[PDB]
């Protein structure tokens, strides 16, 4: 498979290049995708442009690692930045895409809430609970929960991060439990990982 | 610059079949530079390709299809090139099959190639359909509140729950809109239920906990339900 970092940041007029490991031939594609919009062909043959594609952008490969180089950052690079390939006979595979953040104000640490199950849901038999972030910049986090000291991987929706009116972001995760879990453990905990640094908070039944 | 657009059902039952079309526009799906396909991608999510195909024969053959090895037991892919038009069939779907899906043509060692093919690359996509695969009917929300404590420096953060409704959207406010300040809400997950749900938070002075009512005002046009959740100190 491809991996590449899930998040990558730079200032306008700085250069930057993001990483995929795991290519084994030349037939290595690069793909931008703004939000809410269709992915568009930046790079093919590792570095070939698409005709209109600006030549700020380029293609390169060293070992089994292909990168694209981004220089001159202009705000509407920002997007999600895909590699592609061809493997094994004729298939072809993506990587996990890295969101690229045009850096237009200070970095900042998340903010977090971790609500319990309340009292009406539990009397209706289900439970929730409620993870939510804010106040963060770049618009990127990872979440990951926990019960008592162990990870817990089902049951677990988090949105992708959403701009707040004060224009730095927030997300949201939700881990679902039976009220029977709920009550067996001693805590659970939400961790979000936000450049590297995380902030958790625990709750107890 | 040629074009595909893709038409179909955006509303497809679990475990029914998902059939999408594409329509090309300023190029041939006949000729023999390209392949035809597909990919998709769930919200939220990475891209994942589906497969592709050409009607350009070798000698051994009448044409070439590739398929995702994890889909091609449900999977069929077509052309017709009279009307250039490019079609999905996929059966049995689940809520892993949600996606924008995209029409795509490849691009790669097509027109010339040692031993077979090599479309490697997507040189033109569609703008893409989301396909919602649940089997849901229309279905108010439950909403539940999330209480702030009496006792984060002075602010407290409390917040609505809404849980379990279709289709989209629901909308909150909060006192009927005379709380705006510090109000945020949040996209809606489609749960493998099949079912959305989402949550609306706002940040407030600790201090007004015990003399400020908060309640918030949920609207779900589709269901025509309105919920006015009263949400309380703990």
């Known amino acids: 498979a491809l991996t590449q970092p899930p998040s990558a940041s730079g200032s306008p007029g700085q250069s930057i290049t993001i990483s995929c490991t795991g290519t084994?031939?030349?037939?290595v594609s690069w793909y931008q995708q703004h939000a809410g919009k269709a992915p568009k062909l930046v790079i093919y043959?590792?570095?070939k442009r698409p005709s209109g594609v600006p030549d700020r952008f380029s293609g390169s490969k060293s070992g089994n690692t292909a990168s694209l180089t981004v220089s001159g950052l202009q705000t509407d690079d920002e997007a999600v930045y895909y590699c592609?390939?061809?493997?094994?006979?004729?298939?072809?595979?993506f990587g996990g895409g890295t969101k690229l953040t045009v850096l237009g104000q200070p970095k900042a640490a998340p903010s977090v809430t971790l609500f319990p199950p309340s009292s009406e849901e539990l009397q209706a038999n289900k439970a929730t609970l409620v993870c939510l972030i804010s106040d963060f910049y770049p618009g990127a986090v990872t979440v990951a929960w926990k019960a008592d000291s162990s990870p817990v991987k089902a049951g677990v929706e988090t949105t992708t991060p959403s701009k707040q009116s004060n224009n730095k972001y927030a997300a949201s995760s939700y881990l679902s439990l039976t009220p029977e879990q709920w009550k067996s453990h001693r805590s659970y905990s939400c961790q979000v990982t936000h450049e590297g640094s995380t902030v958790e908070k625990t709750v107890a039944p | 610059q040629p074009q595909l657009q893709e038409s179909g059902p955006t509303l497809v039952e679990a475990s029914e079949t998902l059939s999408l079309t594409c329509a090309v526009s300023?190029?041939?799906?006949?000729?023999?530079?390209?392949?035809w396909g597909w990919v998709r991608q769930p919200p939220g999510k990475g891209l994942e390709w589906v497969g592709s195909?050409?009607?350009?024969?070798?000698?051994?053959?009448?044409?070439?299809?590739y398929h995702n090895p994890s889909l091609k037991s449900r999977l069929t892919l077509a052309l017709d090139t009279p009307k250039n038009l490019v079609f999905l069939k996929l059966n049995s779907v689940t809520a892993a099959d949600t996606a924008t899906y995209y029409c795509?043509?490849?691009?790669?060692?097509?027109?010339?190639?040692?031993?077979?093919?090599?479309?490697?690359?997507?040189?033109?996509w569609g703008r893409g359909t989301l396909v919602t695969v649940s089997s849901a009917s229309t279905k108010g929300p439950s909403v539940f509140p999330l209480a702030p404590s009496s006792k984060s420096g002075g602010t407290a953060a409390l917040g609505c729950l809404v849980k379990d409704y279709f289709p989209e959207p629901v909308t909150v406010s909060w006192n009927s809109g005379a709380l705006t300040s510090g109000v945020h809400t949040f996209p809606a997950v489609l749960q493998s239920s099949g079912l959305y749900s989402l949550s609306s938070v706002v940040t407030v002075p600790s201090s007004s906990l015990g003399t400020q009512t908060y309640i918030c005002n949920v609207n779900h046009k589709p269901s025509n339900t309105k919920v006015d959740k009263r949400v309380e100190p703990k």
């Open positions: 795509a043509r490849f691009g790669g060692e097509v027109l010339r190639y040692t031993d077979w093919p090599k479309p490697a690359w997507v040189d033109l």
């Open positions: 300023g190029d041939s799906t006949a000729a023999c530079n390209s392949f």
């Open positions: 195909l050409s009607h350009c024969a070798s000698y051994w053959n009448r044409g070439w299809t």
């Open positions: 084994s031939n030349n037939f």
């Open positions: 043959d590792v570095n």
């Open positions: 592609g390939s061809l493997v094994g006979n004729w298939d072809v595979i």
